[PDB]
């Protein structure tokens, strides 16, 4: 299967036509997506197969072929880019200053950009091109728009 680093669409034939259910990141031979995209199911790449290795419904993250590899964090100051991959449309970078989710357990970066649910798993980058987390888990606000956490996993 295709193991080249970069950003990937996650597709299903289980509904009408080919439907994009989300997006993920291939890095160092590990595929990283959000849990709500795959539900921990196996994936095809060519005639190659990708088996889940790690996941956590609460973090809403999952890794394939190996452990979570993405260790970069928002610095709390700088602007970032959502490498959005929306259904049927080309990969498009969108630059933004993250807001903040305040929680009992701590503060998390949040990005206020409004894309379809199939964009879930699109990566968020720092100025050096490093993935600081994934887009697609958050909240629907006073306005009706979507606000996503910058969801990053731990690297052990």
């Amino acid at each position: 299967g295709e193991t080249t680093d970069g950003v990937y669409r996650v597709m299903t034939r289980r509904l009408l036509g080919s439907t994009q259910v989300g997006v993920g990141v291939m890095q160092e031979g590990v595929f990283h997506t959000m849990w709500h995209v795959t539900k921990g199911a196996a994936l095809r790449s060519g005639e190659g197969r990708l088996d889940p290795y790690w996941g956590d419904v609460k973090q809403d993250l999952v890794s394939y072929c190996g452990p979570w590899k993405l260790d970069a964090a928002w610095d709390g100051l700088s602007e970032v880019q959502l490498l959005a991959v929306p259904p049927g449309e080309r990969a498009k970078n969108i630059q933004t200053l993250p807001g903040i989710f305040k929680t009992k357990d701590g503060d998390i970066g949040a990005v206020a950009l409004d894309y379809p649910a199939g964009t879930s798993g699109s990566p968020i980058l720092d100025k050096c091109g490093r993935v600081i987390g994934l887009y697609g888990n958050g909240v629907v606000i006073k306005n009706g728009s979507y606000v996503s956490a910058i969801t990053q996993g731990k690297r052990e």
Partner: protein, 39 residues
């Protein structure tokens, strides 16, 4: 059976379409990994 198709490199791109606000929101994270607005 879900499958993956490459959609690009992971690169910062100078002069990209800048947009979005920066809201500070009070949120709760449930056991099912669903966020919600505390108020």
């Amino acid at each position: 059976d879900m499958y993956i198709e490459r959609a690009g490199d992971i690169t910062w791109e100078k002069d990209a379409e800048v947009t979005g606000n920066s809201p500070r929101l009070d949120v709760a994270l449930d056991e099912s990994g669903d966020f919600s607005l505390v108020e």
